[PDB]
Write an enzyme that holds these catalytic residues in place. Sequence first.
Site, short mmCIF file in Angstrom:
data_model
loop_
_atom_site.label_atom_id
_atom_site.label_comp_id
_atom_site.label_asym_id
_atom_site.label_seq_id
_atom_site.Cartn_x
_atom_site.Cartn_y
_atom_site.Cartn_z
N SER A 112 44.63 -57.82 -51.32
CA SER A 112 43.73 -58.95 -51.46
C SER A 112 44.36 -60.18 -50.83
O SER A 112 45.58 -60.33 -50.84
CB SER A 112 43.42 -59.18 -52.94
OG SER A 112 42.70 -60.37 -53.16
N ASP B 216 37.29 -41.22 -61.41
CA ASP B 216 38.53 -41.99 -61.44
C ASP B 216 39.17 -42.06 -60.06
O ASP B 216 39.85 -41.13 -59.64
CB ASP B 216 39.50 -41.34 -62.43
CG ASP B 216 40.81 -42.09 -62.54
OD1 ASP B 216 40.87 -43.24 -62.05
OD2 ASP B 216 41.76 -41.53 -63.14
#
Length: 330
Positions: A199, A35
């Site tokens: 992004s 994770d």
Amino acid sequence: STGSATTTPIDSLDDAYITPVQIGTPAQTLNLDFDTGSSDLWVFSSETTASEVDGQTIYTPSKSTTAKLLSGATWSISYGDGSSSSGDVYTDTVSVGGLTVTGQAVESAKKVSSSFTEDSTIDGLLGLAFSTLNTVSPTQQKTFFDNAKASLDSPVFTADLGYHAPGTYNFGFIDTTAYTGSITYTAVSTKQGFWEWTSTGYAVGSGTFKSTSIDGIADTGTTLLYLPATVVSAYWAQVSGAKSSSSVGGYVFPCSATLPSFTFGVGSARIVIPGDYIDFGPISTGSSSCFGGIQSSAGIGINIFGDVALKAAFVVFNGATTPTLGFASK
């Protein structure tokens, strides 16, 4: 040193991935959920409340000649999905894919929430976010990666998750045969303890690319792609009959649909998520309403590039003094 381990989907939907991890001496092999959005290595154990164990493999520290109680240390964690666990702490030898760390903090669960009990395939979590998020008190502990880092050939790990197939976690090296083209690296903020990056935009299907900054985290422990409501609405508007259902808890679509791809930007590069990756199947057995793999982050407080996004790429988690993230197509 290096390590290399195969990671395998837990079910036919790729809801999560498990990777075998050797703990203790002699080794006890547990299948852990790696994770990159948390920083605790915790396991089902011989200390876990009996009624809360249902099929998981447990770690038994009393059977490990290298286990030592970390005296006074406790831990307690709550995840974004509302699940939780807590307990005490041992140090022991931990190996992943041939890479060994001695003195790793292994957090032994005394209690786990129902979601964990109900998932027989996941024996615990191995956190790979920054150690500043580790929950051990009163002395915060380091992640497996942080402990291994100095010994690694290069201070990196990579995630290469498969679509409906096994994939690979590598530590200490970049497998140049595992991706196509070049890797595009992008800046990381560690201010919130995550692999947080920005992004450069998105496209839906064959549509034009929208240049827009989307801050989010690269999170292997989250199944879906969670993005701003504007972006998610633009995606699902291209699927006839798709709608947001408050009763179900997100966007659903007719199982008869063909889903468009979703592209996200990494610098000037582009990662394309095929439409099939966005299908999470019937909302309940036999239903013709299917659950979408792109959902709104509104009210999470952060955008999350979970497995839906990451499995479309070869992803480098570069833990150099100034960390960065790399993405390549594959």
